[model samples]
Target: NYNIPFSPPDITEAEITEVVDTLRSGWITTGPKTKELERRLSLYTQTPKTVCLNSATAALELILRVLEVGPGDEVIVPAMTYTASCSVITHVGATPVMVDIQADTFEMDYDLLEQAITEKTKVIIPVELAGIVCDYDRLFQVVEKKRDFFTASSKWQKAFNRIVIVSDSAHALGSTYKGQPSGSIADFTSFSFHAVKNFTTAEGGSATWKANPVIDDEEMYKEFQILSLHGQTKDSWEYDIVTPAYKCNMTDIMASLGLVQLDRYPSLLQRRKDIVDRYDSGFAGSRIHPLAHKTETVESSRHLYITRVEGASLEERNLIIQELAKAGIASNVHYKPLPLLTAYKNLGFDMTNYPKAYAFFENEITLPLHTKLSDEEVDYIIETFKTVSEKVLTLSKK
Candidate 1:
């Protein structure tokens, strides 16, 4: 059996020490470290504000909540993405319009996206799958062309005067599109720091926003803070409930770990890149097709190494994963298209409606990708892939 596993957390002794120290500190929950992480993230992303929270889902929900999206509102999301990308909209009592993606690229089909927009469409959540940024230029252009259809429902909605772009940048902390960082690309961006992410805080995420002339950054920041902390206004002891909200603040313990990880994020990102380079070189002209990670216009974070098995059906893809599992070499599917899943199907969505997303999912498999994987493990993965793919292909031919 091979010794590799899929996507383990890459924690170091420094992160451990930081977490330990945070635990010993008197203020453990959402204190100094949390605030400092937010400050540093703002600087890092070049965003005017960054809010740390428990999960990227929480950050997305907070944005929708603050924007007052609910019944009669619609949110557009790509079909090819994690359920978290679209499920949060369902939670807000808003209808989620699932749009098809480009074949192989796993990005939203901009033309389809534009067609999906309606007068009720309040937000467009472009998911940067596997750390590659979406075509924001096209997305923004569509929003501009459809400006007449947009009708503002709140103060946040009035600022944009069109469907706002709230990016699900869960895989793209350090990625860049046309040299602009991920957080700055969308009107608002949410980053996941869940244990598997390039930059990990064990269980955390952050949200950043583009500055708006109509919206004061400080006021927006305060509103987010209040909304995330159960809507309590605690002014040095005198407390009042501003509004009933959520409890999704990041703790100091979590932020301390994030601070260290962010400090070393460049190296971590580079290591993942190095792994990707090795895999790319090793698998050249093989029957596996890796996803696009780099382009003249975009640079990805190298978050995952997803490959579509050449001409393989869904059963064939499953067999490949099973073969890897038998060898103890773990692999996965990045996602099943949202429409194919039970939850979305129950919501009256159908997979037949998003043929490209279905095709992408049919043959896709995610390889083990993390900074902690040794060079040897990386080599083993490549060889194992070659062996299993050949065997499976031969079986299919027979």
Candidate 2:
């Protein structure tokens, strides 16, 4: 039986010692460590502002809530992303206008996104699926060209003077687009530090914003801090509620891990890239079609190793997964498109409306890709994958 498991956290003794030290310290919740991580992240991303939160979903909801997006406002989202991308729109009482994705890719179709913009559109959340960066050049062009159709809702929206580009950069922490980092690619970018993500703080995320002339970056940072902490003022006994907000602040314990992870992020990212290159070389010209994680204009984080089987249906994909399971290797699907799910269907969204997203989902399988894997483990996975995939393809032909 194969010994490779699915994605697991790449924790070292450094992480263990940091967590122990944080636990020993009296102050644990959202203290100095959290602030330090924010500072480091700002420097890493070259963004003017950054705010750490409990999860990427929290960061997203906080941004929308602060923007005052509500019932009449429409938030454009790609059809092929995780639920967190679209759920936060509904959480803020805004309509999630689902747009189709590019063929064989999880990125939103720019032409459709441009057409979907209306006077009520307040935000455009482009997801960097599988750590691949979206076409920000096209996105910015569309937003600038369609500024006349935009109707501002809050101070932040008015400051931008257009529909904000809030990237769902959950999978793209270390990805780069045209020599720019993920955080700088959007007006406001939300990043995930969940356990399964490329960089983990157990369960955490952050928000970073571009340098816009109309808003003070410090003020933007403070506003997010308030929004994440029940809208109450920080470090004061006598305080007033600026607005009804949320409680999603990150703890020092999580931040301690984040600090170490960020310090070693370059090596962590390189390990992932090395594994991806190995997989690409082994699977080169095979029946499996790997996602375009890197290209001339973009370099992805190599967060996941998703392969789409040629001519395989949903049933065949499941069979392939079961075959891998028998060999002790665990595989997964990144997502089932939102429309096919119960929640989205109840909201009147239909899978038939997003043909490309569904087509991409049907035969996709995510293999084990994590920093914790040894070279031997990766080789085992590669050999087992080839054997099982060949068998599955042969069965499908009959």
Q: Write out the backbone clash pairs for model 1.
A: none
* Per-model RMSD to reference: 1.1, 1.4
Q: Write the per-residue lDDT of candidate 2 for residues 58-78, one digit (tens) a residue.
A: 999988877788899999998
Number of residue pairs clashing in candidate 2, backbone atoms closer than 3 angstroms, sequence gap of 3 or more or interchain:
0
Which residue pairs clash in candidate 2? none
Candidate 1 structure quality by residue, lDDT tens digits, 1-398: 45687878888899999989998999899999999999999888878989999999999998998889999999999898999999899899999999999875898889888899899999999998889998888889999999999999898899778888999999999999999899988999999999888888889998889776777888889988999998988665589998988899999999999999999998988998899999999889998889878988789999999999888889889999999888778898988999888999999999999999999999999999898788988888899998999999899999
Query: Candidate 1: where is the Cα deviation over 4 Å?
Result: none
In TM-score terms, which candidate is top? 1
How high is the lDDT of residue 27 in model 1?
80
CA RMSD (A), model 2 = 1.4
* lDDT scores of the candidates, listed in order: 0.90, 0.89
Each candidate's TM vs. the true structure?
0.98, 0.97
